[PDB]
């Protein structure tokens, strides 16, 4: 059993780690981690000169980074270094493997703590519009992942899908945001016809503009509320990348996806890998982060519209049964070894007319 | 590490760092959940319940069940709350409730957990200062200052009268007989209230640069009938006090001054010959290498960067920061004219050194 002293030490260490996460976030947004990755052991003043930043701020940052045992400090020379084995997963050189990106979510969630606490008392939720910086960062992260992996890694999970897209299909991306997924697919698959759907006017406008700029005649964008969608047998392929669990009306959205698919069509839904049973998530890395992100964003945004409030950790078992309730009788869950965060749900609609 | 060379310590691998950093992200989330549990009274509620459902916990706390459920999820994966899948019941083990609830007094670690969101709220402002210099003004931190008073208040209620004041040989006797006492950088006036209640024969003045702290203290005095407690608004860097006080106390105010050396000079001047300064400030070394590995060090450098240092730099100040340290504190006491200085420590407050500085008679 854990003692009072052991727990006290463990929680104090958690306090220090929360602080360290904020320092890493600052080091990412300032460019200090990138700067340090390109330098030999250097003084605070040297690092600040190289970074283009105020030395007094750099100095205090380095101090916490050193007590956190990320940055290494030699008292003899007053020099600091970022060892290469840490630098690799904390810098922009790593693209979407840059773990420092995730650290930014600590402040983003902290910014809404007081609003979220109020909802414990008064109900409702914090509206979607309160989180613009959070949404911008999420779109940037998904963008980088799509650039790295959508065409060559993700779509080939679905047996026969690349050939289907090469031959030419009608494809829709539901909750398309920026339109990065639509743009990449429209470039890779000239014979296919792609529609991004989103309820954000700004998203739709942006996608349309980006298509026009690239001369992508096969990429179009439409504003719809996915819960009110009207489309019957329009698409061979529907993709949904993290756009179900935040929904006000997830069951209706899923039913509308089923209805929008042609007989013989396929849904690729990408969403968060977790169990619907709490006990299974204990001890899995990032579980606490996922429940916290849920409480403070994904769940509360849905509850702000009197929605379902399924949350980020809605989990595989519930996702699978909700796909069944939507009409899908053929559902497979794929995983990629290097992706611990997402499940890839492949739901096929029967060919019967 | 090839396996071919003896090394003084474990060389951490890319993988192992990955796992450590991910666990830090989880720990940050857990801190936020504990902060939320403190502010909602959920930790307190659970501490006087047997194992219970999400619905039962919500009912007992008077809160929305859907929020409590998601909270309980994260508290369980963070291994604070325990979940029994057989009965769908949650419980807060007593050994943990003993340091996460108001009833634990000065051992309630849920209080410091509130810092994460508070520093999170200013992160973007602080990042701007890395590029543009200056700092984030003190007025950007209204809630963070309530945290500060909650934290200091735990130590004051537990230790001020019976442990702290007795650290100065003969001070309690002097106070019982009657002395003139000032608390510089007083805040809400918790310490002044406790002293004036304990020592009816002594006169106590709280001084702070906030008019509503001053009027808070002043109201609370008339409301409690403490005629021997008063409060005055001044900036500590510009005072006309000369031989006004037998005793001056300063609790965690020196290191965030714009002009700390000037403030210490003013304290020296304000003391009568043979008087005493009790300066309580953060326990740490002025040498970075000494702080590596000490619990709460990263927390201290982080709060410094994002509050204590930046508020001083906002005023074109010294920016000594939270971790200014024992060596610099002692030399700055020397510079200000204090030739007799001892550093004490107490069990009820791991975060602070108690500097006792005497002015020659
Ligand atoms: N009810 C809705 N109807 C249409 N779009 C919605 C609805 N609810 C949320 N959204 C959009 O769904 C997207 C949710 C995003 N998290 C997914 C964005 C995108 N697929 C990505 O991977 O970056 C946002 O662009 C929202 O504007
Ligand atoms: N230059 C100044 N003049 C007057 N007060 C100041 C000055 N600089 C900082 N402060 C005050 O210093 C106090 C610093 C607090 N950390 C301590 C409050 C209180 N002594 C406590 O232990 O809770 C705040 O109440 C500020 O209002």
Swiss-Prot record, chain B:
| Enzyme class (EC, first level) | transferase
What this chain does, per the entry, is described as: Probable methyltransferase that may target bulky nonpolar molecules with aromatic rings.
Q: What is its EC number?
A: 2.1.1.-
The name this protein carries in UniProt is S-adenosylmethionine-dependent methyltransferase Rv2258c
Q: How does it assemble?
A: Homodimer. Co-immunoprecipitates with DarG in the presence and absence of darT.
Q: Which residues cross the membrane?
A: none
GO molecular function ontology, one term from the record: methyltransferase activity
Keywords per UniProt: Methyltransferase, S-adenosyl-L-methionine, Transferase
Residues the entry annotates as binding S-adenosyl-L-methionine: 152, 185, 208-209, 235-236, 257
**Mind telling me which GO cellular component terms the entry cites?**
peptidoglycan-based cell wall; plasma membrane
> Tell me, what is an example of a GO biological process annotation in this record?
methylation
PANTHER family according to UniProt: METHYLTRANSFERASE TYPE 11, S-ADENOSYLMETHIONINE-DEPENDENT METHYLTRANSFERASE RV2258C
Q: Which InterPro entries match?
A: Methyltranfer_dom, Rv2258c-like_HTH, SAM-binding_MTase, SAM-dependent_MTases_sf
The similarity comment for this entry is: Belongs to the class I-like SAM-binding methyltransferase superfamily.
């Amino acid at each position: 059993m854990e003692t009072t002293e052991e727990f006290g030490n463990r929680f104090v260490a958690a306090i220090d780690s929360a602080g360290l996460a904020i320092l890493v976030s600052v080091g990412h947004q300032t460019g200090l981690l990138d700067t340090m990755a390109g330098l030999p052991p250097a003084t605070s003043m040297e690092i600040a000169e190289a970074a283009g930043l105020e030395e007094r701020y750099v100095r205090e940052w380095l101090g916490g980074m050193t007590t956190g045992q990320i940055v290494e400090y030699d008292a003899g020379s007053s020099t600091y270094s970022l060892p290469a084995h840490r630098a690799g997963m904390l810098t922009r050189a790593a693209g979407p493997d840059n773990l420092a990106v995730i650290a930014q979510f600590v402040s983003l969630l902290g910014e809404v703590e007081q609003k979220v606490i109020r909802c414990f008392r008064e109900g409702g939720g914090v509206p979607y519009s309160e989180y613009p910086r959070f949404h911008k960062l999420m779109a940037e992260m998904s963008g980088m992942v799509f650039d790295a992996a959508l065409i060559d890694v993700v779509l080939p999970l679905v047996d026969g899908l690349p050939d289907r897209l090469r031959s030419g299909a009608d494809v829709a991306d539901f909750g398309c945001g920026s339109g990065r997924a639509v743009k990449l697919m429209a470039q890779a698959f000239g014979a296919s016809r792609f529609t991004g759907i989103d309820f954000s006017d700004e998203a739709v406008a942006a996608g349309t503009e980006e298509a026009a700029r690239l001369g992508l005649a096969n990429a179009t964008f439409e504003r719809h509320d996915l819960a009110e969608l009207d489309k019957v047998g329009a698409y061979d392929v529907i993709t949904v990348f993290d756009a179900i669990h935040d929904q006000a009306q997830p069951a209706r959205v899923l039913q509308n996806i089923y209805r929008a698919l042609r007989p013989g069509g396929v849904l690729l839904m990408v969403d968060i890998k977790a169990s619907s049973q709490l006990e299974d998530n204990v001890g899995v890395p990032l579980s606490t982060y996922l429940y916290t992100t849920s409480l403070m964003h994904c769940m509360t945004v849905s509850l702000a519209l009197d929605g379902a409030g399924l949350g980020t950790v809605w989990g595989r078992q519930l996702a699978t049964s909700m796909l069944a309730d939507a009409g899908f009788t053929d559902v497979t869950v794929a995983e990629i070894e290097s992706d611990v965060l997402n499940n890839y749900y492949i739901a096929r609609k029967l060919e019967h007319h």
